[PDB]
RNA sequence: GCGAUAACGAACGAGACCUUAACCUACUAAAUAGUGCUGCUAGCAUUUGCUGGUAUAGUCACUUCUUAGAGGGACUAUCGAUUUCAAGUCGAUGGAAGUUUGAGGCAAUAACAGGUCUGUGAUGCCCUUAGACGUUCUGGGCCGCACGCGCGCUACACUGACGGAGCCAGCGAGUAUAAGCCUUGGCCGAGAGGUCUGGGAAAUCUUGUGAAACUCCGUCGUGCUGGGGAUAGAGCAUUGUAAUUGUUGCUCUUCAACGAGGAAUUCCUAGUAAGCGCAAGUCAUCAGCUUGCGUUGAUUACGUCCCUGCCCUUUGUACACACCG
């Protein structure tokens, strides 16, 4: 049960070394439930990156 | 093409008091005999009319005796003097090619002949150090 | 980065305060014009000055600019 | 650095 | 064994039986002058 | 004389000068047919300027190129550029410019290096290292 | 008539090109057929030394250069005419050699 | 379809390339599709190439790598471990032979298997470290499509490289087995054990 | 059309000229071909002991065909390779002079070569005739 | 060979003449301050855009020191230092 | 030192080759070594004849890689 | 730099600048560069064609490539987003070039007990100065070997070794009555090398430096194996007055650890890293070294202050020879 979420806004670089990015995701189906999540690789807007689990927000990393 | 044989293969050969694996190719099987390198083994096989596409065990006794004859008498089979192991011998001045058991004997005889006259090269052989001028400050750690 | 320096920023805005009627919004015309208005020692500085004068001219047409 | 001493 | 050549062939290399020293590093106030001849202000005043 | 255009293509150091004359479909590499250009695995790099437009474009022209300098791979890229640029330069001079703009479209839409020489050159070496950016290993 | 070659060498191009043009100029008003000037590939005499007179510090190197520019001019004229052209265009930096 | 007669004769098979551009003049991109919505824009198969060797400038800007052909990105990763750096023609030879082996096995389109092996090999959540100046700390984060694609190529070629080390099996047919096994999602293949192990640890950190 | 040496792949042309030149048999093969190494940088003699000399002469003839008065010193450079110096880096070393010099001498009296003016060895009036012939009989199959 | 001797037109603009003149003054025992300012003002009097004199060594003290005596406008980096 | 691949072809292995190689999706030098337990050199000569005998169809020809398939 | 602003307007440094690389069918010419034509000439099909050779008189043409001088060209140009709508940044399009266009050279105010008096007929002082610490001649040492460490080169194999075949660069250097430079071509020699002539004081000859990786076809077949080439024996040459403590090169033989490397730790963002060779310097000989050059040519960021160094601001100070206080 994986869910796909298009990214709509790149918030900024987070994490200690800056290797992880805060991003604003929007679900492909049910275009609502917008969530803030962290991503490892390089990210542009309009990336369809899929989420193994959806019911979790994200905050700054230490 | 692939061919088959039964009972003719010989797993272990014994040439010049050296055990030769019979499933090794003949040119490189003879290199087990000390004093016979790839370059020398390549030529005695060509002088003995033993085609190199044969394994060691494929050879018959007739070919095996023909090879050991050539290795022990290279100059008699139009093998050039410069191609030989021990040329311009110290005592009799003739061109020789020492083999499995003779090699370490005449290698030894060269060491005492150097040590008997107490030359510098002979001295360093006694000490177990490098003799060809190599630096021993930082690599002679074995 | 492509941040122009003060030797090109102030020299270009002196041109506008002095030769605005003869200037234009075209770099190619400005590039030729600044070669007869100013004594520029090097071609590279001439293009930089004319390239920033054009940007300021393009910005004046969109409204009043501060300092000129 | 050394004192030259003679023998002959 | 008066000549060094004759004795060399009789001296054995007894080197693998003794152990190397555990440490072998053998190669401090640079700011403090050690000349002991301080410069008076008069000398600096007269020179410079 | 006849309808002849002469061009050149370039890679790092390799430069291939192409002579395009009016004739039959003759396409030669240093006096040798292009069907046997080496290395074999990159033979389709020089087939690209041919098969992209269709071999019918080469009925009226014969091409003889002379490639020198560079390396084995760098020479292949120089040849395919000389062919593509040579075909375009012939059309611009002896055929309508509508076709030349047509030919330039397929070539550019497939690979920029077919018409535009790659500008990359080797960075000079600087002292203190074995390479342009590489430096001798430092120890503490 | 005489096929005569004039070879021009110098380190600096301003005086070299003046002499080169001046010789060509005198070979123009005088109806003398000429071939040149031929700009020979410039030679970069490079010497790379160590900066340090001693051997302490970072390994930094100087790279000095000495560019040599060469021009050859071919003239078809009698020997008296060509030699006097050389004295017309004498320059301290540029040396001149005349070969038939 | 007509055969075009030139003064320099052109072989029959290469004249067939006028109809279609195919990888090594053998494999078609038309019937190839990415079975994952999230990696369509980062697996580039829309522009056909003849040979996986273009010598393009994909390291200038940030996301130019997504524009490189997927097979060329795969053949780029083969030439590793020092002795192989810069040996692209050797790498292209390996890929060209690997596709043929992937064709005689399972009979599918070889470049379809390549695309399938890449979508199945990229970990979807990796556990980044959030260690506070030395201490061990891990946090589960998502994986971008670009890193998901290019970690698949890194893992696929690394697994093929190690399977061919000190083994009579050749690298081209070690890559074919590695690509085929990962395409069908078998856990026997390397880079599927790694992908599962990455997503397993990430599950124990969220 | 007129087939030439330049119209046939080099690798399979030499394999065809070597076979013809051996079966023709007029090329004189020196007595040391079973002993010698091709280059000082090599470590082993050629694996095709009976036929290596013929193929090398075929390669030399074709190589001279495409050029003008190439000498024998250039042939040593051409067939030389990287020497396997033990711990020191590799280096280019020329091939053996006698093998190349014997080949061109063997080819010069079989009618394929001659001494060119200003050095080297040009290809003969008949050298083009019989190589271009082999090229035609190379690619019909 | 023929040798001709020509006078330098602007003594203030020739650093060689000014350095030799300064040396002939320092070897006469004149103080450094009086000697340094004699060329600083002579250079400016000739019309120099700038001038800088540095004298380094040891003077009546065991420790050595250097003193710079600048004047006017001086450029330091790039090609113009080779020109002006 | 566990390989011990057979390098001499006896009669039991010969007919086993002609009875087993045809029932292969993909044959090569390593496939013959891996599953028939014969040596690499014996594998190379076996492939060059099996193609001449028609059992094996050459998909691709290369010195470093020989890709073959069944001819049935 | 924008901007905020008791500051305003400036100077040095940065940037500009200079050298180099990339573009120019737009100028200027080139028998020391190349090409097309034309003579003359060869081979193969005979279709009039295709490959060559030759031509410092065919007393041709041209500058596409090649060379180099005068210039042109880019200034982030145009268009979208964001931004204090500012400096800018990110995307596209065009472009040879849109990372300061790539790389360097130069490079401020003071200063360091930084390194060199073992570069100087640069130097103060101290020491020595005829049985010299001066100069020269002979021989040895700087290489010496239980050990710790650093800069590197070969490798641990099949993405490979050999064996044939294909066959492509760029930066440079080069002599005379010497004290001998680069050295082709011919002829000997398995090689290394020897010998006889000639060219080049050089875009002319060495030299297309026909370099190596590389590519093709074969042998090998997972084996310390045909991986690896230490260690050692015998022999053959070269340089040099002189090779012993092997200068170096070549031949045969000898076949060592090493089967990918702990704690740690270095360099690096595009023609870059990594391989791969080549030249110049040292140089009678010797390059596993530097200085450059080109061949093949990537993976991964294009972000941060988590580690480390430095810079700035605040802060404390009994320090100012400044915490080595
Ligand atoms: Mg290597
Ligand atoms: Mg070569
Ligand atoms: Mg070779
Ligand atoms: Mg090796
Ligand atoms: Mg300044
Ligand atoms: Mg500057
Ligand atoms: Mg031009
Ligand atoms: Mg563009
Ligand atoms: Mg810069
Ligand atoms: Mg000190
Ligand atoms: Mg160092
Ligand atoms: Mg090889
Ligand atoms: Mg001479
Ligand atoms: Mg060259
Ligand atoms: Mg070996
Ligand atoms: Mg072994
Ligand atoms: Mg020495
Ligand atoms: Mg040298
Ligand atoms: Mg050194
Ligand atoms: Mg940064
Ligand atoms: Mg910090
Ligand atoms: Mg305070
Ligand atoms: Mg105090």
**Would strands F4-10 and F15-22 be described as parallel, antiparallel, or unpaired?**
antiparallel
Experimental approach: cryo-EM
Q: Beta-carbon neighbour count of residue H167 at 10 Å?
A: 12
DSSP G45-60: EEEEEES-SSS-SS--
Q: Report the C-alpha gap between A31 and F121 in whole angstroms.
A: 49
Q: What are phi and psi of G64, to 5 degrees?
A: -80, 155
B122: which residues sit within 8 A by CB, 6+ positions away?
B111, B112, B113, B114, B115, B116, E9
Instruction: Map residue J24 onto helix, strand or coil.
Output: helix
Question: Which nucleotides of strand L come closer than 7 angstroms to any CB of the protein?
Answer: 1-3, 10-23, 25, 29-32, 34-37, 42-45, 49-54, 57, 64-70, 72-78, 86-92, 96-111, 113-116, 119-120, 131-133, 143-173, 184-194, 203, 207-208, 210-226, 228-236, 244-255, 259-260, 265-278, 287-307, 321-322, 324-325
Identify the H or E element spanning H89: helix H88-104
Q: Report the C-alpha gap between I97 and I100 in whole angstroms.
A: 5
Contact (CB<8Å) B123/E9: yes
Work out if H194's Cβ lies within 7 angstroms of strand L: no
DSSP H22-43: -BTTTB-STT---S-GGGGGGS
Q: Report the C-alpha gap between F36 and I56 in whole angstroms.
A: 22
Q: Report the C-alpha gap between K7 and K44 in whole angstroms.
A: 11
| Widest pairwise Cα distance in chain D | 22
Determine contact, residues H72/H152, Cβ cutoff 8 Å: no
Q: How many CA atoms lie within 13 A of E44 on its CB side?
A: 9
Q: Record the tokens describing residue H158, joined without a space.
A: 């690394």
Q: What are phi and psi of F71, to 5 degrees?
A: -125, -170
Q: Beta-carbon neighbour count of residue B99 at 10 Å?
A: 20
Q: Report the C-alpha gap between I79 and I56 in whole angstroms.
A: 10
Determine contact, residues B57/B23, Cβ cutoff 8 Å: yes
Q: Report the C-alpha gap between B53 and B63 in whole angstroms.
A: 14
Which residue on chain F is closest to H19 by alpha carbon? F51
Q: Record the tokens describing residue H81, joined without a space.
A: 């471990």
Provide the H-helix boundaries in F1-140. Answer: 43-51, 72-94, 97-110
DSSP chain I: ----GGGS-HHHHHHHHHHHHHHH--SPPPTTTTT--SBTT-SS--S-TTTHHHHHHHHHHHHHHTSSSB-HHHHHHHH-EEE--SSSPPEEE-B-HHHHHHHHHHHHHTTSEEEPTTSSEEEPHHHHHHHHHHHHTTS--
Among H138, H21, B40, smallest CA distance to F110 is for H21
Q: What angle do CA A34, A35, A40 make, to 5 degrees?
A: 130
Q: Report the C-alpha gap between C65 and C57 in whole angstroms.
A: 9
Which residue on chain F is closest to I66 by alpha carbon? F31
Nucleotide nearest to F89 (CA to C1'): L25
Provide the H-helix boundaries in chain B. Answer: 26-29, 38-47, 61-72, 100-116, 120-127
Determine contact, residues I35/I98, Cβ cutoff 8 Å: no
Is F36's Cβ below 8 Å from some Cβ in I?
Answer: yes
Instruction: Map residue C12 onto helix, strand or coil.
Output: helix
Q: Report the C-alpha gap between I103 and I94 in whole angstroms.
A: 16
Work out if F121's Cβ lies within 7 angstroms of strand L: yes
Q: Record the tokens describing residue B52, joined without a space.
A: 């190199």
Q: CB pairs under 8 A, 24+ apart, for F28-35?
A: F28/F63, F28/F64, F28/F65, F28/H8, F29/F65, F29/F67, F29/F79, F30/F65, F30/F66, F30/F67, F31/F64, F31/I6, F32/I6, F32/I7, F33/H8, F33/H9, F33/I6, F33/I7, F34/H8, F35/H8, F35/H9, F35/H10, F35/H11
Q: Give chain F positions within 8 Å (CB) of H4.
A: 25, 54-56, 59
SS (H, E, C) A2-62: CEEEEEEEEEEEECCCCCEEEEEEEECCCCCCCEEEEECCCCCCCCCCEECCCCCCCCCCC
**Residue found by looking up tokens 């006259």 in the block:** B117
**Would strands F32-33 and F61-68 be described as parallel, antiparallel, or unpaired?**
unpaired
Peptide bond just before F39 cis, omega within 30 deg: yes
Q: Report the C-alpha gap between F131 and G7 in whole angstroms.
A: 40
Give the distance from residue E8's alpha carbon to the nearest chain B alpha carbon, in angstroms: 6
**Would strands J50-57 and I91-93 be described as parallel, antiparallel, or unpaired?**
unpaired
Q: Nearest CA to the C1' of L147 belongs to which residue?
A: E20
Work out if B103's Cβ lies within 7 angstroms of strand L: yes
Q: Report the C-alpha gap between G34 and G73 in whole angstroms.
A: 7
Q: Give chain H positions within 8 Å (CB) of A62.
A: 130, 132, 137
Q: What are phi and psi of I111, to 5 degrees?
A: 105, 5
* CA-to-CA separations, I137 to F58, I17, I32, I59, I133, in angstroms, rounded: 29, 10, 32, 17, 6
> Residue B67 class from Cβ within 10 Å (0-12 exposed, 13-18 middle, 19+ buried)?
buried
B132 CA → ligand 17 middle, Å: 14
Chains D, J in contact, 3 or more Cβ pairs below 8 Å: no
Work out if B2's Cβ lies within 7 angstroms of strand L: no
Q: Which of E37, E46, E48 sits opposite J62 (nearest CB)?
A: E37
Q: With left for phi above 0 and alpha for psi between -120 and 50, is residue J78 left, alpha or beta? A: left
**Would strands F15-22 and F61-68 be described as parallel, antiparallel, or unpaired?**
antiparallel
Determine contact, residues B44/B51, Cβ cutoff 8 Å: no
Q: Report the C-alpha gap between A22 and A10 in whole angstroms.
A: 6
Instruction: Map residue J52 onto helix, strand or coil.
Output: strand
Q: What angle do CA B98, B103, B105 make, to 5 degrees?
A: 125
DSSP annotation of B127 reads H
Q: What are phi and psi of F48, to 5 degrees?
A: -60, -50
Contact (CB<8Å) F33/I9: no
Identify the H or E element spanning H154: helix H145-163
Work out if I73's Cβ lies within 7 angstroms of strand L: yes
I131: which residues sit within 8 A by CB, 6+ positions away?
I5, I17, I61, I62, I65, I112, I123
Q: Beta-carbon neighbour count of residue I115 at 10 Å?
A: 11
Q: Report the C-alpha gap between G1 and G32 in whole angstroms.
A: 10
* CA-to-CA separations, F123 to F12, F128, G45, in angstroms, rounded: 12, 15, 21
Q: Report the C-alpha gap between B130 and E13 in whole angstroms.
A: 13
Is F27's Cβ below 8 Å from some Cβ in H?
Answer: yes
Determine contact, residues A16/H131, Cβ cutoff 8 Å: yes
Q: Report the C-alpha gap between I123 and I108 in whole angstroms.
A: 9
Among F103, F24, F37, smallest CA distance to F63 is for F24
Determine contact, residues K21/B16, Cβ cutoff 8 Å: no
Q: Report the C-alpha gap between B125 and B120 in whole angstroms.
A: 9
Determine contact, residues H95/H74, Cβ cutoff 8 Å: yes
Q: Record the tokens describing residue F69, joined without a space.
A: 């300098």
Q: Report the C-alpha gap between C33 and C50 in whole angstroms.
A: 9
Q: Record the tokens describing residue I74, joined without a space.
A: 């250039």
Among I107, I114, I111, I109, smallest CA distance to I126 is for I111
Determine contact, residues B84/B95, Cβ cutoff 8 Å: yes
């Amino acid at each position: 049960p994986v869910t796909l979420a298009k990214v709509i806004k790149v918030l900024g670089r987070t994490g200690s070394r800056g290797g992880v990015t805060q991003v604003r995701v929007e679900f492909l189906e049910d275009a609502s439930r917008t969530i803030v999540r962290n991503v490892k690789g390089p990210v542009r807007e309009n990336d369809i990156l899929c989420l193994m689990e959806s019911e979790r927000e994200a905050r700054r990393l230490r | 093409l692939v061919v088959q044989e039964q009972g003719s293969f010989q797993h272990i050969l014994r040439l010049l008091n050296t055990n030769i694996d019979g499933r090794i190719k003949i040119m490189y099987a003879l290199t087990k005999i000390r004093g016979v390198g790839r370059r020398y083994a390549n030529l005695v096989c060509k002088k003995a009319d033993v085609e190199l596409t044969k394994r060691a065990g494929e050879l018959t006794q007739e070919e095996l005796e023909r090879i050991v004859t050539i290795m022990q008498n290279p100059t008699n089979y139009k093998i050039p003097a410069w191609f030989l192991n021990r040329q311009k011998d110290q005592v009799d001045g003739k061109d020789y090619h020492v083999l499995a058991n003779n090699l370490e004997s005449k290698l030894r005889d060269d060491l005492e002949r150097l040590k008997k006259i107490r030359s510098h090269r002979g001295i360093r052989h006694f000490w177990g150090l490098k003799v060809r001028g190599q630096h021993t400050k930082t690599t002679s750690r074995g | 980065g492509r941040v122009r320096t003060k030797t090109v920023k102030r020299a270009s805005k002196v041109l506008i305060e002095r030769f605005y009627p003869k200037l234009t919004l075209d770099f190619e015309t400005n590039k030729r014009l600044t070669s007869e208005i100013a004594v520029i020692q090097s071609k590279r500085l001439r293009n930089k000055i004319a390239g920033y004068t054009t940007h300021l001219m393009k910005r004046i047409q969109k409204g009043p600019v501060r300092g000129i | 650095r050394k004192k030259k001493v003679y023998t002959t | 064994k008066s000549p060094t050549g004759n004795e060399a062939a009789l001296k054995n290399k007894n080197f693998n039986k003794d152990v190397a020293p555990p440490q072998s590093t053998a190669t401090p106030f640079d700011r403090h002058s050690r000349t002991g001849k301080t410069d008076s202000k008069k000398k600096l005043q007269q020179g410079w | 004389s006849t309808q002849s255009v002469q061009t050149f293509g370039k890679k790092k150091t390799a430069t291939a000068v192409a002579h395009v004359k009016a004739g039959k479909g003759l396409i030669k590499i240093n006096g040798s047919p292009i069907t046997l250009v080496q290395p074999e695995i990159l033979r389709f790099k020089v087939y690209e300027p041919l098969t992209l437009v269709g071999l019918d474009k080469f009925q009226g022209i014969d091409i003889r190129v002379k490639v020198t300098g560079g390396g084995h791979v760098s020479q292949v890229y120089a040849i395919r550029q000389a062919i593509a640029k040579g075909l375009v330069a012939y059309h611009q001079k002896y055929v309508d410019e509508a076709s030349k703009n047509e030919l330039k479209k397929i070539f550019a839409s497939y690979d920029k290096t077919l018409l535009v020489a790659d500008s990359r050159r080797m960075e000079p070496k600087k002292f203190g290292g074995r390479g342009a950016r590489a430096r001798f290993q430092k120890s503490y | 008539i005489h096929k005569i070659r004039i070879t021009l060498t110098s380190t600096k191009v301003k005086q070299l090109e003046n002499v080169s043009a001046n010789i060509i100029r005198n070979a123009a008003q005088y109806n003398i057929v000429k071939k040149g000037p031929v700009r020979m590939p410039t030679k970069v005499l490079k010497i790379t030394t160590r900066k340090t007179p001693n051997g302490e510090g970072s390994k930094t190197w100087d790279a000095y250069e000495m560019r040599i520019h060469k021009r050859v001019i071919d003239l078809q004229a009698p020997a008296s005419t060509v030699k006097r052209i050389t004295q017309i265009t004498i320059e301290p930096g540029v040396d001149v050699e005349v070969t038939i | 379809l007509q055969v075009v007669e030139l003064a320099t004769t052109i072989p029959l098979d290469v004249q067939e390339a006028q109809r279609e551009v195919k990888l090594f003049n053998k494999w078609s991109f038309e019937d190839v599709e990415v079975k994952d919505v999230s990696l369509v824009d980062y697996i580039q198969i829309r522009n056909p190439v003849f040979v996986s060797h273009t010598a393009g400038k994909y390291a200038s800007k940030r996301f130019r790598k997504a524009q490189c052909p997927i097979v060329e990105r795969l053949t780029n990763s083969l030439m590793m471990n020092g002795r192989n750096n810069g040996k692209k023609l050797k790498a292209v030879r390996i890929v060209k032979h690997a596709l043929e082996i992937i064709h005689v096995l399972t009979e599918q389109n070889p470049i379809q298997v390549v695309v399938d092996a890449i979508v199945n090999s990229g970990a979807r959540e990796d556990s980044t470290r959030i260690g506070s100046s030395g201490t061990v700390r891990r946090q589960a984060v998502d994986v971008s499509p670009l890193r998901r694609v290019n970690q698949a190529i890194a893992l696929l070629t690394i697994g093929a490289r190690e399977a061919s080390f000190r083994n009579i099996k050749t690298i081209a047919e070690c890559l074919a087995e590695e690509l085929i096994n990962a395409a069908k999602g078998s856990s026997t293949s390397y880079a599927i054990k790694k992908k599962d192990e990455l997503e397993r640890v990430a599950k124990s950190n969220r | 059309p007129g087939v030439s040496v330049r119209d046939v792949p080099a690798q399979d042309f030499i394999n065809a000229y070597a076979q013809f030149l051996q079966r023709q048999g007029k090329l004189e093969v020196p007595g040391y071909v079973d002993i010698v190494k091709t280059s000082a940088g090599n470590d082993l003699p050629p694996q095709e002991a009976e036929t290596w000399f013929y193929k090398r002469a075929a390669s030399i003839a074709r190589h001279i065909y495409l050029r003008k008065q190439v000498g024998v010193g250039a042939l040593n450079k051409l067939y030389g390779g990287a020497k396997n110096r033990g711990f020191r880096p590799h280096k280019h070393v020329d091939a053996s002079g006698s093998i190349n010099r014997k080949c061109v001498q063997a080819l010069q009296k079989i009618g394929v070569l001659e001494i060119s003016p200003k050095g080297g060895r040009r290809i003969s009036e008949n050298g083009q005739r019989d190589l271009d012939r082999i090229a035609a009989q190379t690619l019909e199959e | 060979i023929a040798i001709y001797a020509e006078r330098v037109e602007e003594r203030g603009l020739s650093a060689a003449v000014q350095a030799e003149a300064l040396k002939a003054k320092l070897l006469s025992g004149l103080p450094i301050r009086r000697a340094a300012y004699g060329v600083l003002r002579f250079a400016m009097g000739a019309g120099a855009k700038g001038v800088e004199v540095v004298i380094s060594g040891k003077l009546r003290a065991a420790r050595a020191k250097s003193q710079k005596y600048a004047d006017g406008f001086m450029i330091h980096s790039g090609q113009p230092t080779r020109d002006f | 030192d566990k390989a011990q691949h057979i390098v001499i072809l006896d009669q039991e292995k010969y007919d086993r080759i002609l009875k087993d190689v045809p029932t292969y999706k993909y044959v090569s030098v390593s496939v013959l070594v891996d599953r028939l337990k014969i040596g690499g050199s014996l594998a190379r000569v076996a492939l060059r004849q099996l193609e001449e005998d028609g059992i094996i169809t050459p998909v691709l020809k290369h010195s470093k890689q020989a890709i073959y398939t069944r001819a049935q």
